Design an enzyme around this catalytic site. Structure first.
Site, PDB file in Angstrom:
ATOM      1  N   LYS A 176       9.070  -4.839   2.939  1.00  0.00           N
ATOM      2  CA  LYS A 176       8.354  -3.572   3.533  1.00  0.00           C
ATOM      3  C   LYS A 176       9.035  -2.970   4.619  1.00  0.00           C
ATOM      4  CE  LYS A 176       4.420  -4.369   1.433  1.00  0.00           C
ATOM      5  NZ  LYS A 176       4.851  -5.107   0.240  1.00  0.00           N
ATOM      6  N   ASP A 208       0.980  -1.392  -2.639  1.00  0.00           N
ATOM      7  CA  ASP A 208      -0.070  -2.230  -1.774  1.00  0.00           C
ATOM      8  C   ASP A 208      -0.026  -1.966  -0.440  1.00  0.00           C
ATOM      9  OD1 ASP A 208       2.874  -3.009  -1.913  1.00  0.00           O
ATOM     10  OD2 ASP A 208       2.353  -4.914  -1.039  1.00  0.00           O
ATOM     11  N   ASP A 209      -1.094  -2.337   0.168  1.00  0.00           N
ATOM     12  CA  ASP A 209      -1.222  -2.036   1.671  1.00  0.00           C
ATOM     13  C   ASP A 209      -1.169  -0.663   2.137  1.00  0.00           C
ATOM     14  OD1 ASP A 209      -1.389  -4.878   1.865  1.00  0.00           O
ATOM     15  OD2 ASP A 209       0.174  -5.355   3.257  1.00  0.00           O
ATOM     16  N   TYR A 253      -4.986  -5.435  -5.469  1.00  0.00           N
ATOM     17  CA  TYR A 253      -4.027  -6.497  -5.791  1.00  0.00           C
ATOM     18  C   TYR A 253      -4.553  -7.839  -5.570  1.00  0.00           C
ATOM     19  CZ  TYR A 253      -2.473  -7.056  -0.964  1.00  0.00           C
ATOM     20  OH  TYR A 253      -2.374  -7.101   0.280  1.00  0.00           O
ATOM     21  N   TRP A 285       2.002 -12.153  -8.398  1.00  0.00           N
ATOM     22  CA  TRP A 285       2.823 -12.047  -7.080  1.00  0.00           C
ATOM     23  C   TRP A 285       2.219 -13.201  -6.515  1.00  0.00           C
ATOM     24  CZ3 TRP A 285       4.601  -6.962  -4.449  1.00  0.00           C
ATOM     25  CH2 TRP A 285       4.865  -7.113  -3.135  1.00  0.00           C
ATOM     26  N   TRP A 286       2.835 -14.260  -6.298  1.00  0.00           N
ATOM     27  CA  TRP A 286       2.191 -15.401  -5.551  1.00  0.00           C
ATOM     28  C   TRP A 286       2.883 -15.380  -4.006  1.00  0.00           C
ATOM     29  CZ3 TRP A 286       3.800 -20.908  -4.927  1.00  0.00           C
ATOM     30  CH2 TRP A 286       2.702 -21.660  -4.536  1.00  0.00           C
ATOM     31  N   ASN A 287       1.868 -15.336  -3.366  1.00  0.00           N
ATOM     32  CA  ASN A 287       2.166 -15.124  -1.849  1.00  0.00           C
ATOM     33  C   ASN A 287       2.300 -16.553  -1.030  1.00  0.00           C
ATOM     34  OD1 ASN A 287       2.326 -12.423  -1.136  1.00  0.00           O
ATOM     35  ND2 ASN A 287       0.127 -11.930  -1.401  1.00  0.00           N
TER      36      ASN A 287
HETATM   37  C1  LIG Z   1       0.789  -7.534  -2.354  1.00  0.00           C
HETATM   38  C2  LIG Z   1       0.797  -8.072  -1.283  1.00  0.00           C
HETATM   39  O1  LIG Z   1       0.660  -9.222  -1.194  1.00  0.00           O
HETATM   40  N1  LIG Z   1       1.298  -7.263  -0.178  1.00  0.00           N
HETATM   41  C3  LIG Z   1       1.627  -7.499   1.003  1.00  0.00           C
HETATM   42  C4  LIG Z   1       0.417  -7.924   2.218  1.00  0.00           C
HETATM   43  N2  LIG Z   1      -0.351  -9.016   1.581  1.00  0.00           N
HETATM   44  C5  LIG Z   1       0.477 -10.342   1.986  1.00  0.00           C
HETATM   45  C6  LIG Z   1       1.506 -10.307   2.738  1.00  0.00           C
HETATM   46  O2  LIG Z   1       2.062 -11.599   2.834  1.00  0.00           O
HETATM   47  C7  LIG Z   1       2.862  -9.118   2.431  1.00  0.00           C
HETATM   48  O3  LIG Z   1       4.193  -9.838   2.564  1.00  0.00           O
HETATM   49  C8  LIG Z   1       2.723  -8.232   1.235  1.00  0.00           C
HETATM   50  O4  LIG Z   1       3.823  -7.485   1.230  1.00  0.00           O
END
Ligand SMILES: CC(=O)N[C@H]1CNC[C@@H](O)[C@@H](O)[C@@H]1O
Ligand SMILES: [Ca+2]
Length: 642
Positions: A160, A236-237, A276, A331-333
């Site tokens: 980011k 995203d965001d 998302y 996309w697993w956070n």
């Molecule tokens: C798609 C997504 O998770 N976007 C953002 C914001 N949501 C989770 C955060 O952990 C960020 O790392 C992430 O880049």
């Protein structure tokens, strides 16, 4: 074997790595794979035992075409007394046959085996897409080798905070220095059979005009010149027009039609939506169905599950797939920590349904800004996405730790086990931590608090834990097998060691020889508290969650509660007035004061600071022009100049 092969037949004979060998396939098989093979065969001469390496279609492997799984990235591997076969369904499959071969080789010996293998999920890897300091160039080189070794085929570059990835300088080509470094990353990824996917994140200030469209296009073209052959556009965001579905789909389709379908060799084309996850979807809005209906079929759509942070379930993946009309690219956070930056997340990877491979077209992990530390979840994610049906949570975790730090595995294990939970957070996501000792902690504290006798076994478990924690901290600091990993975790290792020492002292206060010994321990404990406060205020000072927390879920709370308690008992018995607060706080004010950067705040009549500082402002919710300030009489935040 990590990941575990789809099919495996083991013989209980062992054959030696042939001193004299004959290689069939070397000039016709994937050179990356032939290269690994040759390295494993140094000091071995080329008659001899036949070794056959190649892809389906190669002369070298014709005899075995039936045996080679008819799956992308699949392969057939065979070792017996008479010969070795390493045969890929495709070139990457041959390379993966070699990654499995390398793990079988132990002491110049090989087990007699037959393996049929291939991945249950087409795209597997890592998205570097967190907020925070992007990974160093060196971290990245290391990550790409690690990914090849674990059959991860995807690296999505999208930090980011890289200004040439996001707004506004997404419009700008990388500078020469950065560009050459990326060129190197693509080459290394190529060699380790990883698609480097370059993502761009332009939505925040994107204009839906030809100018911006062209700029995006030219950017991609520049990246192509650097060797990039896979692309993504993240939405995203962001807020504003940069979130209009139709416009996104149109942009995606245009990139597809004029770029991904115009180059000869573009592989992955991926887009991360603005909605998302489920809970951020407009119920009954048309965002996801618009994308589902308008995006060209070959374009992947990413998804983080039911919530921003969450594990993927059968009901969840089904919900999303029905709207996007294709299998979600996950996309697993996890282990990403960019919203709990004072924690490390070093626990096992778990929670994701193991039966839904066919329902996802990709699975990538968003890691921590600590790259080496993230290799624990990463190796585990690799294992899970290659073969989810044999995925084993704890075994893979242990295997990762032992791969990352063979020289101090048990110590890393001890450390990671008590650094896994995120603490309370805006996303509601938690992990277990310290489960091994949690029952003992819970019994000990319940008894103690209620004046009911505690079990000596529980007391000893805790004691044993504190001791093991100290040994692993000190051994970890001095480990030089993976220095970059040690650099990343050091602040937490210090904090972890002081936690262990605080626990020993508090335990001694429970035993409590006499009145004078108690005060010695009580004083030692205040000192330790202040030292933890110091680390928390000088290490890892970022704007969001500054500082350093460790063993927060079970251990710190046990030590703190045990302290408050034994002090209260001492105060009762000896009619004393010892302070029982557990977090050292240098300022004075019934809610606890907190210190974050240069803010001094009451947790959501008169504060007294430990000194005079220039006042900056007070923000209260129901400027100081640098005026000197020590007391403040009447959200509740004082900012000072520090
Ligand atoms: C798609 C997504 O998770 N976007 C953002 C914001 N949501 C989770 C955060 O952990 C960020 O790392 C992430 O880049
Ligand atoms: Ca070939």
């Amino acid at each position: 074997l990590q990941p575990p092969p789809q099919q495996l037949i083991v013989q209980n004979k062992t054959i030696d790595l042939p001193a004299v060998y004959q290689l069939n396939g070397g000039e016709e098989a994937n050179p990356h794979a032939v290269k690994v093979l040759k390295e494993l065969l140094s000091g071995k001469q080329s008659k001899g035992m036949l070794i056959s390496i190649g892809e389906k279609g190669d002369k070298s492997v014709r005899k075995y075409s039936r045996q080679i799984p008819d799956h992308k990235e699949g392969y057939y591997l065979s070792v017996n007394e008479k010969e070795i076969v390493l045969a890929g369904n495709d070139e990457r499959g041959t390379y993966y046959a070699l990654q499995t071969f390398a793990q079988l080789l132990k002491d110049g010996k090989l087990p007699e085996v037959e393996i049929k293998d291939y991945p249950s999920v087409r795209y597997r890897g890592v998205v570097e897409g967190f907020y925070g300091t992007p990974w160093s160039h060196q971290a990245r080189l290391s990550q790409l080798k690690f990914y090849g070794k674990n059959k991860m085929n995807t690296y999505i570059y999208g930090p980011k905070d890289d200004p040439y990835h996001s707004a506004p300088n997404w419009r700008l080509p990388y500078p020469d220095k950065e560009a050459a470094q990326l060129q190197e990353l693509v080459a290394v990824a190529n060699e380790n059979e990883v698609d480097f996917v370059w993502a761009i994140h332009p939505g925040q200030d994107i204009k839906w005009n030809k100018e911006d469209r062209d700029l995006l296009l030219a950017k991609f073209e520049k990246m192509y010149q650097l060797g990039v052959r896979s692309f993504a556009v993240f939405f995203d965001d962001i807020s504003g027009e940069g979130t209009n579905p139709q416009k996104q789909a149109e942009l995606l389709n245009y990139i597809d039609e004029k770029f991904a379908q115009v180059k000869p060799d573009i592989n992955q084309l991926v887009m991360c939506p603005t909605e998302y996850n489920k809970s951020w979807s407009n119920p009954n809005g048309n965002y996801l169905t618009t994308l589902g209906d308008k995006l060209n079929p070959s374009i992947q759509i990413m998804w983080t599950g039911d919530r921003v942070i969450s594990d993927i379930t059968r009901d969840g993946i089904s919900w999303i797939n029905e709207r996007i009309k294709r299998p979600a690219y996950i996309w697993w956070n996890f282990p990403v920590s960019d919203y709990v930056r004072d924690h490390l997340l070093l626990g096992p990877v778990y929670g994701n349904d193991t039966t839904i491979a066919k329902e996802m077209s990709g699975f990538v992990t968003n890691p921590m800004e600590h790259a080496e530390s993230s290799k624990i979840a990463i190796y585990s994610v690799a294992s899970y996405a290659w073969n989810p049906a044999k995925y084993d949570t704890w075994q893979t975790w242990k295997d990762a730790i032992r791969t990352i730090l063979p020289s101090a595995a048990e110590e890393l294990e001890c450390f990671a086990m008590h650094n896994s939970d995120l603490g309370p957070n805006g996303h509601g996501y938690r992990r277990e931590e310290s489960m091994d000792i949690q029952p003992a902690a819970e019994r000990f504290l319940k008894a103690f608090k209620e004046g009911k006798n505690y079990d000596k076994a529980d007391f000893e478990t805790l004691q044993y834990t504190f001791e093991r924690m100290k040994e692993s901290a000190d051994i970890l600091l001095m480990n030089t097998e993976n220095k970059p990993l040690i650099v990343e975790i050091t602040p937490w290792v210090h904090q972890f060691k002081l936690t262990a020492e605080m626990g020993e002292e508090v335990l001694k206060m429970v035993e409590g020889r006499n009145e004078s010994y108690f005060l010695r321990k009580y004083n030692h404990v205040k000192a330790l508290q202040q030292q933890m406060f110091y680390i928390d205020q000088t290490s890892n000072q970022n704007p969001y969650q500054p500082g350093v927390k460790t063993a927060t879920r079970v251990i710190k709370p046990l030590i703190d509660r045990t302290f408050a308690t034994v002090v209260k008992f001492f105060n009762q018995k000896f009619n004393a007035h010892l302070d029982a607060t557990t977090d050292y706080m240098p300022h004075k004010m019934n809610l606890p004061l907190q210190v974050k950067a240069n803010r001094v705040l009451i947790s959501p009549v008169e504060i007294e600071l430990d000194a005079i500082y220039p006042g900056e402002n007070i923000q209260i919710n129901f400027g100081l022009q640098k005026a000197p300030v020590k007391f403040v009489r009447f959200q509740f935040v004082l900012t000072i100049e520090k």
